[PDB]
Every structure is written in structure tokens, then in C-alpha cells.
């Protein structure tokens, strides 16, 4: 039973009072949201994703495994879920990753595993991040506009230069949590107060905006309930 129903056929998004989202969240995860979790949620869009990763070792969603297209992220998700479904130790995970036709060509796959969480408690999850390319005002325009181009072979986007810099006069980022039960994207407007949670179609979440000129689809390990 999904956290929320799907969107109507003629709807691009549904808006949620934070209080109503939390109740739906608590029904779905079958437990009360903690104070640390509520505090993370109050950070806005980034909080929706941090709370859903369910990982106390994270304050920000990890960008290690970021890709130019949703389909690549979905393939990487399936590959990773297949490996952690065998309950590997960290060393067994590294070996498995090395043999996997998709994962072995990627950067940061080994780093993506949280060693202190047993692999039987993990699942690969997806979120989409929108951001501004000009992360250093000193960069030339050519550098800004090529730094986050996806690898022509693996579709992987190098995020190591990313500094959470906003386009001057705009919001720094958006994060959208991929709800694969209903095929919607969960985000928010900004941090508390007056935070509103959004449940959007991918097209609406991805729509042209002055704030952002880059979008990636990112795979990260979440901790199961
Ligand atoms: Cl739409």
C-alpha cells in the first residue's frame, strides 16, 4: 500500500501540508517520525530525500552515483539491488561490483556502500537533483557548461566539483525523491517555516526554470524499515 495515491490523469502535481505528509509517511513506514527526522524534513526539498534514505550517517544525500538519465539510474539501481540481495560483506560487495557488466565501469560504487549497515538492510533508491552548473564564479562559461556532462559511455556525471552554489538570485537546488510505487517525484518549496511538500510528475519536477541548468538522477543506498 503506497504512501500516497497516484496523481489524477490531468494533474502535474499534488501539494501536501507537511503535517499531512508526515502522517502519510508514518502510515507507510509503520512508525513515528523521530525528532531528528522532523528536523531534517524541515530543511525542505533536501530533507524529503534525506529522511527517505533513513540513514543517520548522512546529512546530505550522497552524489557519488549520479547520471544524466533516469534510465541509467534505474539500471544501476537494479544492478546494486541484485548484489545486496545476496547479503554481501563489504569485501564481497567490492568483488561483486568488479564483476558486474554495468557497475565495473563506474566511479564511486565501492564508496557508495555504507559499511556499518548490514547489506541485508539496504536498498538502492533514486532521487533527482537539479542544480546550477556554474559552481565556481571563476570558471569560464565553457568550463561551467561541460563540467557536468554525462560520460558518453556510462552516462555518469562527475559531481566532485559540486559546491552547492546557487545561480545568484535563485535557489541552490531541488531534490526529488523517486516514489516508484506511483511513479511520482517528491520535493518541496523550501525549508521551514511555510514549507510545502510536492508530489509531481517527472515532467513537472523537471520543467524549465531560471534557477537550474543541470539535472542528474542519483542512486544511493537507503536503509529499509
Ligand atoms: Cl506533467
Residue numbers in the entry: 2 to 226
Sentences from the paper on this structure:
To gain further insight into how the small KalbTG sequence can fold into such an efficient MTG and whether the substrate specificity as determined by the peptide array can be explained, we determined the crystal structure of KalbTG to a resolution of 1.9 Å. Superposition of KalbTG with its next closest homolog, the MTG from S. mobaraensis, shows a similar disc-shaped core structure (root mean square deviation of 1.5 Å) of a central β-sheet with flanking α-helices and a surface depression forming the active site cleft. However, KalbTG is more compact, having much shorter surface loops. The catalytic Cys-Asp-His triad of KalbTG is located at the bottom of the active site groove. The groove is wide enough to be covered by a kinked helical propeptide in the unprocessed enzyme, similar to what has been observed with the S. mobaraensis MTG zymogen, indicating that a similar zymogenic mechanism may be present in KalbTG. Strong difference electron density extending from Cγ of the catalytic Cys-82 showed that this residue is modified by a thiol-reactive compound, the origin of which is unknown. The electron density allows tracing of four atoms, and these were tentatively modeled as a β-mercaptoethanol disulfide adduct of Cys-82. As in all other transglutaminase structures, the catalytic Cys-82 in KalbTG is located at the N terminus of an α-helix, which reduces its pKa and increases its nucleophilicity for attack on the substrate glutamine. Of note, the catalytic Cys-82 in KalbTG is embedded 1.7 Å deeper in the active cleft than its S. mobaraensis MTG counterpart, raising the question of how the Gln side chain of the substrate peptide might reach it. However, these are difficult to distinguish from water in electron density maps, and no NH4+ has been identified in the KalbTG structure based on geometric criteria (four hydrogen bond acceptors in a tetrahedral geometry).
